[PDB]
Amino acid sequence: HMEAIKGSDVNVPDAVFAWLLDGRGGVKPLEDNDVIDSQHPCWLHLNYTHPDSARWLASTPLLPNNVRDALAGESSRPRVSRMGEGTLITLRCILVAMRLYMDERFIVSTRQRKVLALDDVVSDLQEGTGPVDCGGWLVDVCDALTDHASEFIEELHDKIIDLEDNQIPPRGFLALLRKQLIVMRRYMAPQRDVYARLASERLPWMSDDHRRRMQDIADRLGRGLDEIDACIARTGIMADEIAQVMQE
Amino acid sequence: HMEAIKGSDVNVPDAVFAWLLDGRGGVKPLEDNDVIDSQHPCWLHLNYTHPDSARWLASTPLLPNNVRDALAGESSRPRVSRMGEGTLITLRCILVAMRLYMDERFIVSTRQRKVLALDDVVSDLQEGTGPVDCGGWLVDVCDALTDHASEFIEELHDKIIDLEDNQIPPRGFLALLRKQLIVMRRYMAPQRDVYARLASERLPWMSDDHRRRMQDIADRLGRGLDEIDACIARTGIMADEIAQVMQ
Amino acid sequence: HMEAIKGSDVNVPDAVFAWLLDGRGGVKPLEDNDVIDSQHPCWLHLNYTHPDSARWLASTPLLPNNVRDALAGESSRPRVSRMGEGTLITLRCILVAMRLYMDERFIVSTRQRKVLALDDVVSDLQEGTGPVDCGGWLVDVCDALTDHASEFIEELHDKIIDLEDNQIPPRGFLALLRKQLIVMRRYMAPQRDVYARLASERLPWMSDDHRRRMQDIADRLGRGLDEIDACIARTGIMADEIAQV
Amino acid sequence: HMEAIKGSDVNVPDAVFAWLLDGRGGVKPLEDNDVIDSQHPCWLHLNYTHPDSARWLASTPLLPNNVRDALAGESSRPRVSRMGEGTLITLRCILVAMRLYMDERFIVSTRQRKVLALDDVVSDLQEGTGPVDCGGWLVDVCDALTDHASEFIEELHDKIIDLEDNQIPPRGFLALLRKQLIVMRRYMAPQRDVYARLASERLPWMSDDHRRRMQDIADRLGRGLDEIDACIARTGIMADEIAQVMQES
Amino acid sequence: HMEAIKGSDVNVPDAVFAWLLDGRGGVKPLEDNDVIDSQHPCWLHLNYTHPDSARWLASTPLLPNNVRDALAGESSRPRVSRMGEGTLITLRCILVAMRLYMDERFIVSTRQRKVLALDDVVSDLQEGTGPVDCGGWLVDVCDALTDHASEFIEELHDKIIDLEDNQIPPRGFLALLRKQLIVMRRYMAPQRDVYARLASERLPWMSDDHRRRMQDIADRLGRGLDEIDACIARTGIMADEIAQVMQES
Ligand SMILES: [Zn+2]
Ligand SMILES: [Zn+2]
Ligand SMILES: [Zn+2]
Ligand SMILES: [Zn+2]
Ligand SMILES: [Zn+2]
Ligand SMILES: [Zn+2]
Ligand SMILES: [Zn+2]
Ligand SMILES: [Zn+2]
Ligand SMILES: [Zn+2]
Ligand SMILES: [Zn+2]
Ligand SMILES: [Zn+2]
Ligand SMILES: [Zn+2]
Ligand SMILES: [Zn+2]
Numbered sequence A: 001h002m003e004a005i006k007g008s009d010v011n012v013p014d015a016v017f018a019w020l021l022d023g024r025g026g027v028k029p030l031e032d033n034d035v036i037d038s039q040h041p042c043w044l045h046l047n048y049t050h051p052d053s054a055r056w057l058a059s060t061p062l063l064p065n066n067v068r069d070a071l072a073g074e075s076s077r078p079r080v081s082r083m084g085e086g087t088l089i090t091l092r093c094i095l096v097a098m099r100l101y102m103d104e105r106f107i108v109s110t111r112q113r114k115v116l117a118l119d120d121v122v123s124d125l126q127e128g129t130g131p132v133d134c135g136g137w138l139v140d141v142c143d144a145l146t147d148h149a150s151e152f153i154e155e156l157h158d159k160i161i162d163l164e165d166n167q168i169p170p171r172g173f174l175a176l177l178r179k180q181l182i183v184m185r186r187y188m189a190p191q192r193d194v195y196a197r198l199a200s201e202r203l204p205w206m207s208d209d210h211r212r213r214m215q216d217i218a219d220r221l222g223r224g225l226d227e228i229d230a231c232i233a234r235t236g237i238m239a240d241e242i243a244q245v246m247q248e
Numbered sequence B: 001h002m003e004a005i006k007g008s009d010v011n012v013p014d015a016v017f018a019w020l021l022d023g024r025g026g027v028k029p030l031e032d033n034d035v036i037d038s039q040h041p042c043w044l045h046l047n048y049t050h051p052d053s054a055r056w057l058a059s060t061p062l063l064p065n066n067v068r069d070a071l072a073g074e075s076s077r078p079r080v081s082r083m084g085e086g087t088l089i090t091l092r093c094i095l096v097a098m099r100l101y102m103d104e105r106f107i108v109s110t111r112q113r114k115v116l117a118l119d120d121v122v123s124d125l126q127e128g129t130g131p132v133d134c135g136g137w138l139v140d141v142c143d144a145l146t147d148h149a150s151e152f153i154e155e156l157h158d159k160i161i162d163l164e165d166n167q168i169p170p171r172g173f174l175a176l177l178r179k180q181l182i183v184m185r186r187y188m189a190p191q192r193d194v195y196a197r198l199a200s201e202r203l204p205w206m207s208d209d210h211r212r213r214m215q216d217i218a219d220r221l222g223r224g225l226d227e228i229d230a231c232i233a234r235t236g237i238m239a240d241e242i243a244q245v246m247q
Numbered sequence C: 001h002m003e004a005i006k007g008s009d010v011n012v013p014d015a016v017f018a019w020l021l022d023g024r025g026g027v028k029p030l031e032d033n034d035v036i037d038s039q040h041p042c043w044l045h046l047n048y049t050h051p052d053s054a055r056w057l058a059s060t061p062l063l064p065n066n067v068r069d070a071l072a073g074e075s076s077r078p079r080v081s082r083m084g085e086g087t088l089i090t091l092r093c094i095l096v097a098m099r100l101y102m103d104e105r106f107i108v109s110t111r112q113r114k115v116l117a118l119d120d121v122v123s124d125l126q127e128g129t130g131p132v133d134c135g136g137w138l139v140d141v142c143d144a145l146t147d148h149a150s151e152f153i154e155e156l157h158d159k160i161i162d163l164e165d166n167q168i169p170p171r172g173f174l175a176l177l178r179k180q181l182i183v184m185r186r187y188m189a190p191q192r193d194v195y196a197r198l199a200s201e202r203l204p205w206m207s208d209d210h211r212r213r214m215q216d217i218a219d220r221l222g223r224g225l226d227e228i229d230a231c232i233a234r235t236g237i238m239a240d241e242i243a244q245v
Numbered sequence D, E: 001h002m003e004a005i006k007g008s009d010v011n012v013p014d015a016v017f018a019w020l021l022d023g024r025g026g027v028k029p030l031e032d033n034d035v036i037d038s039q040h041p042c043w044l045h046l047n048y049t050h051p052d053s054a055r056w057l058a059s060t061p062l063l064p065n066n067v068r069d070a071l072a073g074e075s076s077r078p079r080v081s082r083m084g085e086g087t088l089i090t091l092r093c094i095l096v097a098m099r100l101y102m103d104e105r106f107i108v109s110t111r112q113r114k115v116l117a118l119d120d121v122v123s124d125l126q127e128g129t130g131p132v133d134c135g136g137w138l139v140d141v142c143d144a145l146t147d148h149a150s151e152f153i154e155e156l157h158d159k160i161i162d163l164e165d166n167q168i169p170p171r172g173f174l175a176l177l178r179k180q181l182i183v184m185r186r187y188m189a190p191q192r193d194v195y196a197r198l199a200s201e202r203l204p205w206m207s208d209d210h211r212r213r214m215q216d217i218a219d220r221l222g223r224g225l226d227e228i229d230a231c232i233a234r235t236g237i238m239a240d241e242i243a244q245v246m247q248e249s
């Protein structure tokens, strides 16, 4: 339902990636004579820390005003925001960030520090088992970012489970854990609202099929928050059984 | 499905705003020869504290009897109530209020103190990325009012997290937080029922699309209540580890 | 889908109310030459404590056997029960009761003590913003009964919140609250099951639209129970921080 | 969608009941010239403790192998199991049991001790306000079995609420309650899984209408479990405020 | 919607099983002149510890690159992963594992230690009351794996309920339970995510009917996690009422 584009109009030199999805599950580097539409979307992966990249970001007409700033590093909190046709999403993992603006024709994503999550999607597109629409891509990314949180949370619980095997712990160790748990909750909560939202807002580029998935992920990430709230309330308890053993 | 109106019949002089939505995402001030229907609804934003405004509120035929009173400041609790065609909704943020009556043709909203939430919707309509139907507007408003609560709750939890780091706190500080938490819960609960309800009642002016969203918001605001119940149960705890450190 | 009735066949003399819904949102007292069907249902509001009323209740053919007893005061717990075409529902508020039997054609409701909830529905029908089908009525009633509980629960929590601001309380005050909370839970729980159920059972007279609503209400009343369970667990705690005095 | 049957092929002498549903809401004792199909299902209510009954159970061709054993008393836990066309369900109330196998044509249900729940369905069929399909019957039964648990739970909570009004309790009373609560949970939990499942598995003989109901019931029974978990966690607490009133003595 | 196969192309010698589903609820050993499609899928049950089996696993063209490694024992965590047409699922029970790759045409499953769960599905296919599509199979397996967890959790709760009756326990016993509970949670949580997901992702080979079921199972297994979290929080409590009984002697 959108205006088709020329392969040139989105050409950045030092662009980490610049792929055209085949719609069958793979990619090919974007050449000047390719057409870009819903069926074959374009994925630009920028490091907003490079010259040509941050230049292209502030200039190119393919973005609204407001997104430029945010796409350039100005956001902190996870949020989905609607720029009419386009959508500006800010996500976090493990704290590393990732800002992307997307409509049905293309996905442009800007990071500074590498995101293990976006690699998995390249590894899969290079192989041929990757996404096919923008909507799919987005799900695959959020799945990944949540796999990561889900694992990293098992690791903290892992450690907190051994501390509960108690010989007291090394001074200030219990705080470095509490700190991490809290950092996690501070960002994993809002990012869940975003997942949940994207599962409700009907965007052109997302199928009822995709929304069922964002529901998965949100509800999943949701349960992760519950396991964190637990871990935290149990580091508050271990700090009282610690100020105790050292009284008797 | 409703009777179209003349642009004049809703003309208030000191009316803070008086816009006609274009249905594309923007607005234009209401002139006498504009037509008002589902496609191009009218949004009146009154300060019920001005003469012409409170006058127009009690007079104009475009409102049922019952709403006049409430639109005029008589309500406290968040509530959606149905006046047949129209709907009277009372919402709160951060405690500031906002009463509105709306049907498919128009939205009339009355505040006394400014509501940061209704600005965001003008900022966005002036720009062209705003709502398009009454239904959309209502969601965008509720999204905003909930973004605000959500943040302000992160701020309280922020402070309560530092107090849990613990050198005692300043006398009576822990009560000013408990107080705020409780104030929030007192109003953010009923307001969540309203969200949820609006997500169930099938109004003409709201799409299955919009109801999915009111569900979002409701369930979201819902989780905010949970984070508050926590914050509170943990200020009750910190006041016992305080009567202990002062034991 | 039911047999139309004559306006006379449901005529009670001291019947508190006896209205015919217009299907537009209002009412008019029932006269002998009115027709009663799905589109214009009849609402009889009896005080089963009056002669003509309790008489008419035990006699009239318009009710099955079993309901007569219950319509007459024999029930305590909230319950929906199916008498084939008709439905017998027992509801409580604030403990005051209200028994009603309804099919698509008419609603007959019996109370002893006045129910603020059923007034609101008259106030609204007299005004013209009231229900239009039996299905709608039932939702509007349950909404009301739940608005009441919801408020009265904020009042208890209100009080329990001040007691948590603690100078000890007046002896035996904390028990009159615990008592109320528990009275509330004893009846507000089963009545939520009823709401939930009505939101599932497909009655002829209720639209998918109305069931979405009974879901609202039930889920709502549901969360009220949660706030009660809290209030109670916190009066059990306040009695230990009191014996600590 | 199943093969119609002769009225004779399911004739048991001492069979507590042996009814043919009219599909309008009532019954009539099964005679030899009645036809049995979806529209008019047959309900056999056996006491597997009688001769002719347990005989008929092990013999008659109208049951698969596997069910015979279980229909005969071999099962303990609530379960729904699929025997292709048929379905074998084991349910419990108040611990009393009830095993039944059913397809669209007929319901055969075996008990040993009387089940107040299955009476209610006879009282209602004799009167004419009872079920009409097998699917409905099954719902009405599970509604009843849950009404019973729901009430009995209010009774335990009732007593546990008075004990929390505390003068100590009679020695060993708090354990007979904890015991009951726990007994309840051990069986009411699995039985809720069964309800929930029946609300998901699409059997021929159950309408989308009936599944909405098994959902009701399951989610209801669900909340009952929650109220039990509470009751139990609060008898664990009352036994510590009791060892306290007997340490401070 | 997929390319039909010859009966030979999937022939392994020491293959524990190698069945063709009849689509009616049973099986027959795979012969060279059988056709394999959605209607009659092929089920290979391999022990990746045998020569011919692990050989066939690394060679045969009927698997993508990535799955070979994992199908061969490389995975630990429960996960569903999509290889385009196919799907690679890793599941655990009671810790024993089971890796499988499946599309609409065939299911290939690899274990090392026997899985009581996959037997039940053979016992039922040999009898004729088993699955009919790949989708059904997958539900029947997960039902089973969850029945097992559900029971084993009742057993730990069982024991934890007796310890709460309380004469102290044998030193280090309460840790062997905590350990088990924790082991269970570590794997039964992620495995629930997989169930839930399979209930959302629309695969060709799963009906809306089957998804309702994976919902069942996921929500069920869900509730088991809740009962574990409880059991654990109550072994943390019993270790404090134990360091208490051993203070005042
Ligand atoms: Zn293509
Ligand atoms: Zn990552
Ligand atoms: Zn934890
Ligand atoms: Zn227009
Ligand atoms: Zn605001
Ligand atoms: Zn907090
Ligand atoms: Zn009419
Ligand atoms: Zn009331
Ligand atoms: Zn409270
Ligand atoms: Zn017939
Ligand atoms: Zn019973
Ligand atoms: Zn209880
Ligand atoms: Zn075939």
Ligand SMILES: [Zn+2]
Residues within 6 Å of the ligand: E093, E094, E115, E116, E117, E144, E145, E148
């Ligand atoms: Zn197993």
Ligand SMILES: [Zn+2]
Residues within 6 Å of the ligand: E157, E160, E227, E228, E230, E231, E232
């Ligand atoms: Zn347990």
